[PDB]
Amino acid sequence: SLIPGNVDLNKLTEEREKLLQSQIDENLRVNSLSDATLEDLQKMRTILKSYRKADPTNPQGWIASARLEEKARKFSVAKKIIENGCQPRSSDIWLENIRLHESDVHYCKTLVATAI
Amino acid sequence: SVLLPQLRTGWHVDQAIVTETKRLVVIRFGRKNDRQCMIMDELLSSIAERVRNFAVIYLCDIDEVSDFDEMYELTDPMTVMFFYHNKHMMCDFGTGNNNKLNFIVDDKQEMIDILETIFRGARKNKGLVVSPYDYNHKR
Amino acid sequence: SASHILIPASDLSWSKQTDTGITHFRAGMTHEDEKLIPTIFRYITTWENEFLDSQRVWAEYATKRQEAIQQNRRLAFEELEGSWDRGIPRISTLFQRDRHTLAYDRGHRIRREFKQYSLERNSPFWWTNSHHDGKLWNLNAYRTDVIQALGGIETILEHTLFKGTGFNSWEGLFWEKASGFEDSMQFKKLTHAQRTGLSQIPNRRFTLWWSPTINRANVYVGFLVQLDLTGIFLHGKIPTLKISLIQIFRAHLWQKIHESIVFDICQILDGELDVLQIESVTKETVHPRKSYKMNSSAADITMESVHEWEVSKPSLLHETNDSFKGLITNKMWFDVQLRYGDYDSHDISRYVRAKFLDYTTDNVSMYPSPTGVMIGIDLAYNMYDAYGNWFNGLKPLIQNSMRTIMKANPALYVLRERIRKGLQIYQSSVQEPFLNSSNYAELFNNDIKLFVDDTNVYRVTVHKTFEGNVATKAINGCIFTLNPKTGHLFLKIIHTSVWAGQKRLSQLAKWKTAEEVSALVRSLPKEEQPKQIIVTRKAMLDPLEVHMLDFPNIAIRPTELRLPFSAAMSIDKLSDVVMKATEPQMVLFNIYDDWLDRISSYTAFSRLTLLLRALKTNEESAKMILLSDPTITIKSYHLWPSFTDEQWITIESQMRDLILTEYGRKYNVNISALTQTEIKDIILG
Amino acid sequence: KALPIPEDQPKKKRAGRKFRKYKEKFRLSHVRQLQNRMEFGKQEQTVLDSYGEEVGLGMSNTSLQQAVGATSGSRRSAGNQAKLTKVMKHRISEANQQADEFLISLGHN
Amino acid sequence: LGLLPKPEPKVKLSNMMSVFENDQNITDPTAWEKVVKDQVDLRKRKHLEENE
Amino acid sequence: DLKDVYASKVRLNASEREELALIEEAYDNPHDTLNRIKKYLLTQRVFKPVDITMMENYQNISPVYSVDPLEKITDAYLDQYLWYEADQRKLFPNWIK
Amino acid sequence: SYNIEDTILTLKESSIFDDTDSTEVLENVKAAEENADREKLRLRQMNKDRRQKKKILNVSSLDIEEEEEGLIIG
Amino acid sequence: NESTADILKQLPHERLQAVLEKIPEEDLEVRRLLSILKKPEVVENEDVQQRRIRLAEILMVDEIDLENINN
RNA sequence: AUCCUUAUGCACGGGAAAUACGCAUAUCAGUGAGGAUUCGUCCGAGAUUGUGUUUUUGCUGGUUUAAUUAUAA
């Protein structure tokens, strides 16, 4: 349990005060870790690239390669990938692309109208 | 100093080496008046009770017995030497002289480790042992 | 480093061997500002720039927060993804998940200053909590700049024994840390001397790794000493590397290598007597000390001719232009000289030409004729060459042969392992422990577990007809996952229509199965969620992890045992459910019928192993063991028919009989001679 | 008192359900072993210790988990969990039981 | 001294899986179940017999 | 803040392992440890001896005090409490650095 | 689409990224473990014969190399 | 055959068990030897078998002679 | 005769620990050891000293090819 990377305070507090209150009622990511190395993240890129090349359809892959690279890197990469594989029926690539890529009103509307 | 017995003839030395089969024989060759000879006498005097099982320590004076002077080439105020089954033992300390011993050891534990390692390597007939501590900054 | 330190141009020289030849690289001939080792003074920003960036950063954050709420919106990361590391409180600290409970932590800057008196550790950072302040420096670039300053990974590996380890590429390799190695030795009861004796091992690995640089004529000067039975020279005492080189060559290994390659070139030429018109090939007698003696050497293999040969100018293997009109002479010889090289000269060319000329011109040496071939090999850098007198059909032979000779020989293969035990460098693919025969008994602990086998996902049936050939029809597959305890099945039935419009149908299978396992595990509450998911195919290890990142508590294992779940489609009720399904579906089963009421789950699973293993083999004739008595009725509920206990006790023997007879019959092995652990090993896999 | 003797003794072995449960305290577990593996060629995962000194966990996280930064749950050994000495365990329980009658005395009053 | 037979390992339904000394553990699953269970019932039988 | 001392350690000395048992039970039984701490505050006036060592900075040799871990729990809680309430009530002025 | 042979054929084990774009094969379940157990058996009996009878193998370059050596529309 | 029953005889459990059978079995006779020897007539909870074993033990420790010589 | 309470012995079944269990031609100790307190008092059997072993005691399991003999001459 002393592996140091796991500890976060929120889950420990809401995990704790509920056990406290239960006992009373019965009585009645870390900032510390180094950022991912380009070559590991590159391994991720190759695997996910194989998985998106596995299915051109099945948007689940596109959304997955979008959100995982998002948590990893994001910025341009994800926002380009999503727009790439978004080329139509499935609404989810649009619900995701809208959320991430927008940052400004006009372009929000441009993505919304395409989904419509 | 009073704790350790002294050897007053060459035959007490030789028989002390011969009559003891199962544990190392450790002799300090030196004289009572010397500065370096009393220090290793105190160090070895504290260690004797711990080690009595696998080694025994004796004392020899050069003026009392001058017979071994030429044979083992005794110089410097003191030389500690290690004997197992009449066989002179040998260990490379880094001092460049794998024979005998010269300098004053500092800590009890470091000398007990020398005794222990020389003993353990001596049970296997191994002539040369390698100390865990190369002190050669001393010699 | 804080200091001025330059890499001299002699350190950067690095060579690489390819099947075409040996290429060299030196950057020193370029004359410019000499390459320096970087220092921190570049990589730490001044306080001024950090505070002066802090005011403007917090200003920008305030403005952006006002613009977000001004739009009735919350801050998007992409806005602040421009500046994270900038500003002293470190804006990243605003997005930490634990911040909500850090606000109640007050007075910490004082607590750290007072940790001096509660405990004995020097705390070189008493002025920062990486929780409150954040990470105030990144030295990551110092590393890449150090790697490039030294010339790259390659120019570094020329300074090591890496090429001796025999690895082709360094990608999949890892080190066994000596820190932890020192911990596992201190759980035994040991004397203080036994204790200090184990702290010199990591130094000893380090001295091996850098040995080709640490041992060279320029570093220690001194006088050469020769390790007794080897060709290794020690310039300094170097007490550790002496010991380690002695433990690398054991039981006259240097001689076994020379004798080995000689045997090899022998057995390559001896069969070629015909093609090259050779009357005889005779490997000569060996003065047993010849391999490791340096000054003088004598020919090993001798070669004769049907008439005579056409020699050429003495040259090297990989050279092209050849002229055989130079001479016509009779018979040939070969030396094979092993060399253990320093970083000074690792080049085998110059060594082979210098030794060739010296020996051929030496009076003390002994050679059958003045026509011969020297073949040198560096065992540290795994290199080779020949400076020969050449004839038609040698270089295209000797090259192709030496290619195999360096990568084959058990001698070299023994070097490479004796070395990489000393370096404790390893290869790995899967870090997780496999299921073994000895590991089997852990399956039945209290951890909830699952078995997932994809061998049935995409299937094709070939039928025999009279006229054309091979009637083939795609069929509904199934993902077969069971937990062994509750005996409960999850089958995702994969319909044929799912395969209609795609190509490269192989990888789609493994990824679809990964997805279906993710959906299946997410369907289960955290009460029912497994811990170890166990998969037969190794190719399913990567595609599961991708989908399982959301569940870090669940662990995934492969198996060395082949589990008999591919035969699960031989059960009639199951296969009927699979053939009639018109849609992808999910159907629950209990394979154990009711076996758990009368009998524990362990023996219920281990009888299932028998039932299925025999269905892999004789199939329907293993079914005639089951269906013998029609008075024994399979209900609509169950799969297997209802028996009493003893009826099963006999049936299990009959089922074991098919396994033990067909294993031997196929492999020509007698049943009776088998040891008990060999029978259980045959049943498991 | 004397050091017993340096002579090594022949090793004796037993592995039970009881005794493996004993030595579970004394062995490096699987996850703890993966900290001891340094992958050749690239930097470790290191996490800042409370004193700020980087604590490397080398292989403990799958090659994909460095990219995502999700660390791992993996398999936690519950056998090496820290537990109390016989002297401390009764002192705690005693302190709590008397604290209970204290909280009751304040409860009715 | 040899005057008393060497003791055989106690096998329970928990320990049942991990005892490989006997023949029938994995190869015959159900007869090994019967062996173990009858061993247990036999020990409890010895207890009750002693009491009576 | 008592726990983080042991996070960088692969191995545990006998005492450190005891203290980890203390922190772990303090998590597992929070109500019980709250009651125990509060009664220690109202009640316990007598404590077990503190042990001295000395750090060498090679210049300044400074005392280092090791207390018993039960007492360390109440001291940690009381410390955190006093600082939270003290700064929440704006006790220390600007010039206490 | 490439085959190896009222019989059923399944996909042979292949690594995702190492396979990448490559020809895929269809083999029989019993035939794969059949061939594997024949070869590995031949290795086991040669193990017992080598270690028992203490014979040293000729092998070397060509032998070990040759040991390294070891369509349907639907 | 000698070293087999010698180790077996040298052992304290067997050495007591051989004395156990030669002391007579009744309440009043067991009790009478104890009362004469001055040791406790009765202890808290014992079946007369256990009392008899206390005869054997007490005879063993003191190395006192048999009830023959006792009386 | 049934049923119940306490203590002790043997024992089936279920846990936890082995920084834990012991030993003493040895010093004391309900004729008061060792503690607690809200300052009125309250609890009531070990404490010292030396020593043996203590990542361990005993026992086990796995892995590292029989003889005989047949042709038409």
Swiss-Prot record, chain B:
For this UniProt record, give its keywords in alphabetical order, as a comma-separated list.
Acetylation, mRNA processing, mRNA splicing, Nucleus
Q: What is its main location?
A: nucleus
UniProt xrefs under SMART domains = DIM1
GO biological process per UniProt: mRNA splicing, via spliceosome
Instruction: Kindly list any coiled-coil regions of this protein.
Output: none
Q: Which Pfam families match?
A: DIM1 (PF02966)
Q: Where in the cell is it found?
A: Nucleus
Task: List, alphabetically, the GO terms of the cellular component aspect.
Answer: nucleus; spliceosomal complex; U4/U6 x U5 tri-snRNP complex; U5 snRNP
Question: What family does this chain come from, according to its entry?
Answer: Belongs to the DIM1 family.
**Its biological function?**
Essential role in pre-mRNA splicing. Also essential for entry into mitosis (G2/M progression) as well as for chromosome segregation during mitosis.
Cite the record's note on assembly. Component of the U4/U6-U5 tri-snRNP complex composed of the U4, U6 and U5 snRNAs and at least PRP3, PRP4, PRP6, PRP8, PRP18, PRP31, PRP38, SNU13, SNU23, SNU66, SNU114, SPP381, SMB1, SMD1, SMD2, SMD3, SMX2, SMX3, LSM2, LSM3, LSM4, LSM5, LSM6, LSM7, LSM8, BRR2 and DIB1.
In Swiss-Prot or TrEMBL terms, this protein is called Spliceosomal protein DIB1
UniProtKB/Swiss-Prot annotation, chain E:
User: Where is this protein found?
Assistant: Nucleus
This protein's source sits in the domain of life called Eukaryota
Subunit structure as annotated in this protein's UniProt entry: Component of the U4/U6-U5 tri-snRNP complex composed of the U4, U6 and U5 snRNAs and at least PRP3, PRP4, PRP6, PRP8, PRP18, PRP31, PRP38, SNU13, SNU23, SNU66, SNU114, SPP381, SMB1, SMD1, SMD2, SMD3, SMX2, SMX3, LSM2, LSM3, LSM4, LSM5, LSM6, LSM7, LSM8, BRR2 and DIB1.
Outline what the protein does: Participates in pre-mRNA splicing. Part of the U4/U5/U6 tri-snRNP complex, one of the building blocks of the spliceosome.
Q: Fill in the misc note.
A: Present with 432 molecules/cell in log phase SD medium.
Q: What is this protein called?
A: U4/U6 small nuclear ribonucleoprotein PRP3
- Gene encoding the protein: PRP3
Segment of the intact protein contained: 262 to 313 of 469
UniProtKB/Swiss-Prot annotation, chain F:
Q: What is this protein called?
A: Pre-mRNA-splicing factor 8
Q: What is known of its domains?
A: The MPN (JAB/Mov34) domain has structural similarity with deubiquitinating enzymes, but lacks the residues that would bind the catalytic metal ion. Contains a region with structural similarity to reverse transcriptase, presenting the classical thumb, fingers and palm architecture, but lacks enzyme activity, since the essential metal-binding residues are not conserved.
Q: How does it assemble?
A: Component of the U4/U6-U5 tri-snRNP complex composed of the U4, U6 and U5 snRNAs and at least PRP3, PRP4, PRP6, PRP8, PRP18, PRP31, PRP38, SNU13, SNU23, SNU66, SNU114, SPP381, SMB1, SMD1, SMD2, SMD3, SMX2, SMX3, LSM2, LSM3, LSM4, LSM5, LSM6, LSM7, LSM8, BRR2 and DIB1.
Miscellaneous information on this protein: Present with 468 molecules/cell in log phase SD medium.
* Coiled-coil segments on the chain, per record: none
Q: Which gene encodes it?
A: PRP8
Region of the whole protein represented: 918 to 1014 of 2413
**Compartments where located:** Nucleus
UniProtKB/Swiss-Prot annotation, chain H:
Per its UniProt entry, which superkingdom is the organism in? Eukaryota
- Subcellular location as annotated: Nucleus
Subunit annotation: Component of the U4/U6-U5 tri-snRNP complex composed of the U4, U6 and U5 snRNAs and at least PRP3, PRP4, PRP6, PRP8, PRP18, PRP31, PRP38, SNU13, SNU23, SNU66, SNU114, SPP381, SMB1, SMD1, SMD2, SMD3, SMX2, SMX3, LSM2, LSM3, LSM4, LSM5, LSM6, LSM7, LSM8, BRR2 and DIB1.
Function, as annotated, reads: Involved in RNA splicing. Is required for the association of U4/U6 snRNP with U5 snRNP in an early step of spliceosome assembly.
* Miscellaneous field: Present with 1770 molecules/cell in log phase SD medium.
Q: What is this protein called?
A: U4/U6 small nuclear ribonucleoprotein PRP4
Protein source organism:
Saccharomyces cerevisiae (strain ATCC 204508 / S288c)
Q: Which gene encodes it?
A: PRP4
